[PDB]
From a paper:
[name] splicing, executed by the spliceosome, proceeds in two sequential steps: branching and exon ligation. In exon ligation, the newly exposed 3′-OH of the 5′-exon attacks the 5′-end phosphate of the 3′-exon, releasing the intron lariat and ligating the 5′-exon with the 3′-exon. In this manuscript, we report the atomic structures of the human P and ILS complexes at average resolutions of 3.0 and 2.9 Å, respectively. Comparative analysis of these three late-stage human spliceosomes reveals the molecular mechanisms of 3′-splice site (3′SS) recognition, exon release and spliceosome disassembly.
The ILS complex exists in two distinct conformations defined as ILS1 and [name]. The ATPase/helicase [name], which is responsible for the disassembly of the spliceosome, is only present in [name]. The only compositional difference between ILS1 and [name] is [name]. Similar to the S. cerevisiae ILS complex, [name] is bound to the middle portion of the NTC component Syf1. Although the rigid core of the spliceosome remains unchanged between ILS1 and [name], binding by [name] results in marked positional shifts of surrounding components. Comparing to ILS1, the U2 snRNP core (U2-A’, U2-B’’ and the U2 Sm ring) undergoes a translocation in the [name] complex. The U2 snRNP core is displaced by about 30 Å away from Syf1. The helix IIc of U2 snRNA, which binds the RRM domain of CypE in ILS1, is co-translocated with the U2 snRNP core and consequently dissociated from CypE in [name]. The RRM domain of CypE interacts with the intron sequence instead in the [name] complex. In the ILS1-to-[name] transition, the BPS/U2 duplex and the ensuing intron sequences are rotated by about 45°.
Residue numbers in the entry:
A (entry chain K): 63 to 93, 105 to 169
B (entry chain r): 3 to 133
C (entry chain L): 703 to 752
D (entry chain s): 68 to 134
E (entry chain q): 3 to 134
F (entry chain t): 67 to 133
The structure:
């Protein structure tokens, strides 16, 4: 019950083929390229800016996610116990 | 800690007041517009009925070796591969469960007829000893 | 490209050294959570069975 | 039409359906597994009724036969 | 990860359904038994209204990572929304340079007519005086 | 459009590829308009030094005409 999204998604999975991305930026060639050069400079600047931003977030946050992921994990295994205790009781009852 | 629709770790979790279950806002907002009821309990629920919750925020460490290039090419490609080959394999799992359902119920009803056939057999054999 | 990507590679390798360890740390946690969510359902299913 | 910001908005809107579909597909997945589990358990449970019944029926035969 | 009332790491988290916030069950239970209210917003809340944290249901999740499709899409917003501000830094600075260039080229065009007349007048004064 | 989805992947690739160059071209033009502006400021201040010597040659001429 979805729009166009479902038609191309089901076709991609059925055919077993992922849609090709931009295989351009990595290769390139020395000696149109004035634009391609100016793309690279801006991208590099963003990476430094993103790297600083990423490092800046990673630098202090690098472990913040881990702290949150440990609170998320322990909650599941508490449920595992609560389910374990009910079922055991039921089994015991049946046995008796 | 997770969303009860997609299997996400929500960025803006919101709880419904009819059934205490945390959903990611976008996914619960979509369900209410599709059909105005709670997805789990099938109880009447609206967009105003929801209550947004707050937490210390979730942090993902963007890989150190990251850029516009892998994020456009390699990472996004793997995400639509992993979505495609999983749901196709999940559709394969649902098809076999229904086939293995039919082998279960037939073998069950086959056993019922054996019991019914042996219930007439045993008590009449015991009755014959009484006679 | 020279100035920025050299800074990026320095920022990346400095982050990577600190954060590839924290990535591995994070990845494991995520995997564990996933696994747990898998045991949770089998116990709920078996709870409703029993 | 061929801009940029709304393409990402469109990418969200189609994903919003993807999540809603995966939910209803999973509900029926697990809700059917409950019927599968309760049946298989109760089947092999009802199967042990026969094993018991067959051996008693058998005991009634040699008893009456030898008498 | 924290309890908002005490500030500890709660060993039994239960989320309320009036002010969305993760409280420790043993702490919030005593707050409700004191008076039927939510500590933050002071809205009415009972013990049955409070709900423990649970595994969603049957869909399996994975932890929040950079791979995950939704986290990757919200990343590309950060990319473009930051690059859009990068364009303002160059659009605003261009409107100062071209405005200073416009007044500079006007002062150049207003001045060079006076250089042309003094080169005429100083040579005309040398043409006039030398002949006499 | 009905548009194939694998193609929509390569569109978003091209559109980011285009915006990266449309941001680059707009920055090197800003640096060269400021650079060519700085060449005008040197000529502006160099010209008003050359007018001072030309005024002296006119002042020297007005003294000789009087004599």
């Amino acid at each position: 019950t979805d729009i166009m999204r479902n038609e191309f998604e089901r076709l991609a999975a059925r055919q077993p083929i992922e849609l090709l991305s931009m295989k351009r930026y990595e290769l390139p060639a020395p000696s149109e390229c004035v634009n391609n050069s100016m793309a690279q400079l801006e991208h590099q600047a963003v990476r430094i800016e993103n790297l600083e931003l990423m490092s800046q977030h990673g630098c202090n946050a690098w472990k913040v996610y881990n702290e949150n992921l440990v609170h998320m994990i322990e909650h599941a295994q508490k449920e595992l116990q609560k389910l374990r205790k009910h079922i055991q009781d039921l089994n015991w009852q049946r046995k008796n | 800690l997770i969303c009860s629709i997609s299997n996400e770790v929500p960025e803006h979790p919101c709880v419904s007041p009819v059934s205490n279950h945390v959903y990611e806002r976008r996914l619960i907002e979509k369900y209410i517009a599709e059909n105005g009821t709670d997805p789990i309990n099938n109880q009447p629920l609206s967009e105003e009925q929801l209550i947004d919750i707050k937490v210390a925020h979730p942090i993902r460490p963007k890989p150190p070796s990251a850029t516009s290039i892998p994020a456009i090419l390699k990472a996004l490609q793997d995400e639509w591969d992993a979505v495609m080959l999983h749901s196709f394999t999940l559709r394969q799992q649902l098809q076999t469960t229904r086939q293995e359902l039919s082998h279960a119920l037939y073998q069950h009803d086959a056993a019922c007829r054996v019991i019914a056939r042996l219930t007439k057999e045993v008590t009449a054999a015991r009755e014959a000893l009484a006679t | 490209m020279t100035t920025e990507a050299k800074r990026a590679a320095k920022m990346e390798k400095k982050m990577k050294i600190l954060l590839g360890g924290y990535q591995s740390r994070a990845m494991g946690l995520m995997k564990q959570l996933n696994d747990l969510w898998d045991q949770i359902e089998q116990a709920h299913l078996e709870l409703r069975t029993f």
